């Protein structure tokens with residue numbers, strides 16, 4: 446979904462994405478299309494921020510890379 | 517927004533209803549939210565995939581409707 | 589997701605209003621979203637504990653109301 | 662403090678209360694205190710808008726003044 | 733309320749529960765009973781994914797075995 | 804104002820804030836005024852619980868103290 450993703454960053458426990466207001470459930474639904482397969486344990490969207498976590502055998506950086514590879 | 521997100525627009529005697537793709541309601545409802553009472557929009561409230569928008573006094577539902585299609 | 593999540597059903601001239609347990613609105617609304625304009629539902633919107641639903645053309649609010657009752661049973 | 666409420670207006674079907682970003686569910690939780698007692702049939706809130714309708718017998722004008730003589 | 737829960741899994745940061753579309757808030761409300769009496773620090777729900785986290789002194793695997801308890 | 808924010812706590816991954824029912828998005832809105840270079844990485848809000856996580860550089864406690872110097 447084009448330029449709705451305003452920013453993608455991360456840290457020790459989660460990969461955080463910021464979107465235009467109200468776009469979070471939209472972009473987050475995209476990640477859930479791949480989800481577990483790629484190594485996304487889960488994703489939760491608020492209004493303009495998304496939190497997603499990698500599985501075991503995957504670290505946040507591996508997540509941060511595949512996500513880029515998506516958008 | 518994007519129209520591949522808006523799946524259907526329709527109306528009755530009280531509100532104009534917009535259906536969208538799962539998760540898109542809030543995104544699309546913010547567009548209508550840019551139109552004020554003067555345009556005939558009293559309000560707009562979105563759920564997960566449906567939006568209920570209602571006419572401001574002085575505009576009938578058909579009014580709000582043709583206006584929304586114009587907006588799109 | 590028993591209908592014990594549904595606390596009350598009633599209407600007026602524009603919409604049919606349902607009151608559910610807190611946090612059960614979206615879930616109960618999905619059910620109604622399985623009906624469609626053909627059974628007379630123009631649309632359905634859920635908050636946290638309340639749901640507003642409204643009838644399509646040629647359907648009065650009372651018709652939507654009786655369809656919901658039978659939709660839940 | 663109710664500096665979060667921006668406007669209450671009406672029409673033949675509902676009463677709209679525009680709210681600051683996010684304050685919609687909080688302010689709306691206020692309207693659920695009134696119930697069918699004070700003529701409320703129900704209220705749904707979004708992110709910054711609330712729709713509310715009068716119970717049987719009450720008109721929207723009545724419901725409007727309730728929310729005014731209550732807010 | 734039974735089949736509303738599709739999957740429960742975890743990693744080094746949170747336990748994530750996947751549920752039916754729209755049941756996130758209801759199920760996450762079930763978790764909100766346990767409180768910090770258990771190992772829970774917080775639980776946040778979206779539409780179909782639930783992110784919960786362990787409080788100081790508990791591991792994420794603790795919170796996990798305990799949530800299966802609850803369910 | 805008054806009892807809107809019921810608690811702020813933390814663990815290994817995020818700072819958890821509990822609020823009054825439906826107050827989460829509002830409280831979260833304040834948290835989003837601060838970000839990245841100011842400590843915060845992202846803030847998600849459910850209905851009464853909030854999860855906030857530190858920008859990759861800060862300790863969850865750095866972020867925590869900053870949030871305290873508000874509530």
Ligand SMILES: NC(=[NH2+])NCCC[C@H](N)C(=O)O
Nearest residue numbers: 470489490539778779780781
């Ligand atoms: N219908 C939807 N909005 N789906 C998107 C879900 C995104 C994410 N799993 C969440 O629950 O927050």
Ligand SMILES: NC(=[NH2+])NCCC[C@H](N)C(=O)O
Nearest residue numbers: 491492493494682831847848
């Ligand atoms: N208009 C609002 N709800 N603003 C608050 C957003 C809070 C947080 N960024 C979230 O996405 O959950």
Ligand SMILES: NC(=[NH2+])NCCC[C@H](N)C(=O)O
Nearest residue numbers: 563564565566617633634754
């Ligand atoms: N994934 C869901 N929550 N689905 C139910 C949607 C309920 C209703 N149509 C709404 O948009 O508010």
Ligand SMILES: NC(=[NH2+])NCCC[C@H](N)C(=O)O
Nearest residue numbers: 635636637638686705706825
């Ligand atoms: N936890 C809450 N936000 N409660 C307030 C409910 C507001 C309104 N009845 C709705 O269903 O949208």
Ligand SMILES: NC(=[NH2+])NCCC[C@H](N)C(=O)O
Nearest residue numbers: 466467561562707708709710
């Ligand atoms: N940032 C947003 N999600 N804005 C959309 C709000 C849409 C509509 N006024 C509502 O309150 O439900």
Ligand SMILES: NC(=[NH2+])NCCC[C@H](N)C(=O)O
Nearest residue numbers: 610611760777849850851852
């Ligand atoms: N009335 C409710 N929706 N209760 C459930 C809240 C679930 C979760 N603690 C959240 O705040 O996201």
Ligand SMILES: [Pb+2]
Nearest residue numbers: 452453454455
């Ligand atoms: Pb960045």
Ligand SMILES: [Pb+2]
Nearest residue numbers: 499500501503
């Ligand atoms: Pb991992």
Ligand SMILES: [Pb+2]
Nearest residue numbers: 643644645647
């Ligand atoms: Pb009709």
Ligand SMILES: [Pb+2]
Nearest residue numbers: 654655658659
């Ligand atoms: Pb029948």
